[PDB]
């Protein structure tokens, strides 16, 4: 579950922190919020390798472009470079991204699908929990949201995904990008799914395990004298 | 002088010396005559031997059933250009079921020669060609220079002492143009023309080479006892 919500003076993106291998939860605290540029962040869904690889590649080329032009990077640049790359690979790079940021042009919120289609909105959601999240956004979104209201709406939309989607879970990560301010990255903004104490300590008595052999491993280089 | 090292260099008077040197190779070449009426077009070529044991270098090449040329200069260059004409004639037949126009054959030779005069590393062609043919607009005679200049003529001659034959044709213009439906008399006029370019040597049976193309006459070459009739 990834959402983006436009507010008065900026844009806010949120995401859950679960990655899956089939029906198994591989990472209970994944990081789906990526820094393309200091003030351009995007949330990714789909193939985990593809979303990291595609944001890092465009993030690198955006940095070189920014140095070349002596200008702070624009969201439309990151957006254009991402969609032309994804279109080239005809959806085989399974990157579904919500691209947000503030630049000299203002605040922007975009979504980009794996086949290279982009769209513009005040509120977007992508991933398996998009329908759960979009249900909350369609119920509670209004024009002229404050910063505090937009964070609340964004995190509530992620929670909708966490509870009601088996693909989404664990914590809520938020990133607020306000015009004329430093982007604040709120890692684990909410912790609604903290595991309870176990009934028993499964710490074993020492010597429980049967050992065939023991040896020192040499990690040091070839020594002197 | 300083401007003849390669074909990519103009002289201070706007001359291309490598092209002019290529033009010189033609003048050293043996004489060949071309002339036509309205019905037929004739090539007459004086073939050159190395010595008495040697054969007489072939001068006339067939390009299609309706077209062919005579050469003066580097024979290998005539082979490259005649092979190109054969292909272009062939492409026209296969793709468009169309016999290639003699005028368009000229335009294609011109453009092939030109590319070798404007690019570094290459060299101009060292041969001059007389192309005869019969197409949908009747008999044609063309003169090719490796500068790229191609000219349509009633008659002409290229090679050593060619000026003698060219003057004769310039006098006979009104006579030989009217020789319609008489191939033998048109060849006679061609043999009498090339005769004006001879010195010491005369036309023998293995010396003379004649080719003709016309209304109901495919491009055919005559050598040996087939030209004894015209000596």
């Amino acid at each position: 579950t990834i959402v983006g919500v436009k507010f008065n003076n900026g844009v806010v993106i949120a995401a859950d922190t679960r990655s899956t291998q089939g029906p198994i939860v591989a990472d209970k605290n994944c990081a789906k919020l990526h820094r393309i540029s200091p003030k351009i962040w995007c949330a990714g869904a789909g193939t985990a390798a593809d979303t990291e690889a595609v944001t890092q590649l465009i993030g690198s080329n955006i940095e070189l472009h920014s140095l070349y032009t002596s200008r702070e990077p624009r969201v439309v640049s990151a957006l254009q470079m991402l969609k032309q790359h994804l279109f080239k690979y005809q959806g085989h790079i399974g990157a579904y991204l919500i691209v947000a940021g503030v630049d000299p042009t203002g605040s922007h919120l975009f979504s980009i699908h794996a086949h290279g289609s982009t769209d513009v909105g005040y509120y977007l959601s992508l991933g398996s929990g998009s329908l759960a999240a979009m249900a909350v956004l369609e119920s509670h979104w209004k024009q002229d949201l404050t910063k505090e209201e937009a964070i609340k709406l964004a995190s509530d939309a992620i929670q909708a995904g966490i509870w009601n989607d088996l693909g989404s879970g664990s914590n809520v990560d938020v990133c607020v990008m306000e015009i004329g301010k430093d982007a604040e990255y709120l890692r684990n903004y909410l912790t609604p799914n903290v595991r309870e104490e176990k009934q028993k300590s499964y710490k074993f008595p020492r010597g429980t395990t049967a050992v065939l052999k023991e040896s020192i491993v040499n990690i040091c280089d070839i020594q002197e004298e | 002088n300083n401007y003849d090292g390669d074909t990519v260099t103009f002289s201070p008077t706007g001359r291309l010396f490598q092209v002019e040197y290529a033009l010189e190779a033609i003048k050293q070449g043996s004489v060949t005559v071309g002339l036509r009426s309205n019905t037929h077009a004739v090539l007459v070529a004086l073939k050159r031997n190395a010595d008495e044991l040697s054969s007489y270098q072939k001068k006339i090449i067939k390009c299609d059933e309706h077209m062919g040329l005579s050469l003066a200069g580097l024979a290998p260059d005539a082979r490259v250009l005649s092979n190109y004409l054969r292909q272009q004639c062939n492409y026209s037949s296969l793709v468009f079921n169309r016999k290639l126009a003699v005028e368009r054959a000229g335009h294609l030779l011109c453009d092939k020669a030109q590319k070798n005069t404007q690019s570094y590393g290459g060299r101009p062609y060292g041969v001059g060609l007389l192309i005869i043919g019969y197409d949908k607009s009747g008999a044609h005679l063309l003169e090719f220079q490796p500068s790229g200049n191609v000219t349509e003529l009633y008659g002409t001659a290229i090679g050593a002492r060619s000026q003698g034959a060219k003057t004769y044709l310039e006098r006979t213009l009104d006579t030989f143009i009217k020789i319609d439906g008489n191939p033998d008399e048109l060849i006679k006029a061609g043999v009498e023309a090339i005769s004006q370019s001879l010195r010491d040597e005369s036309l023998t049976v293995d010396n003379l080479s004649i080719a003709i193309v016309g209304k109901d006459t495919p491009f055919t070459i005559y050598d040996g006892e087939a030209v004894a009739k015209y000596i």
Binding site: - | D4, G5, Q18, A22, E24, A25, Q28, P76, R123, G126
Partner: protein
């Protein structure tokens, strides 16, 4: 320096005219054609008496019906012979017959002016 494909003011290719000088320095080769056959003879010209003369190969078979004698920089001939043999065999593969002596010669001579930069 100057182009390899350059014409002289007399309308001759410098490099071709110079190669003809290299051939004049070569060992003698003679051919005589008759109605009973064609004879080919060469001077071997060993540089020393320790050189095993029978190893000097200046007469070479191209096909069963075509022989070849050479004079000049004889090392240059190896690739010309190779091409001639390939041409003779290739034509027999494509047409189930012996290749005409003139056609084989023409094939070898098509390599001659394939030089430049």
């Amino acid at each position: 320096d100057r182009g390899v494909s350059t014409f002289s003011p007399e309308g001759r290719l410098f490099q071709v005219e110079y190669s003809l000088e290299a051939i004049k320095l070569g060992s003698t080769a003679i051919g005589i054609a008759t109605k009973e056959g064609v004879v080919l003879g060469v001077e071997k010209r060993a540089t020393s008496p320790l050189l095993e003369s029978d190893s000097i190969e200046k007469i070479v078979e191209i096909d069963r019906h075509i022989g070849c004698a050479m004079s000049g920089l004889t090392a240059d001939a190896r690739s010309m012979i190779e091409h001639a043999r390939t041409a003779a065999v290739t034509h027999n593969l494509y047409y189930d017959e012996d290749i005409n002596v003139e056609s084989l010669t023409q094939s070898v001579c098509d390599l001659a002016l394939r030089f430049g930069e």
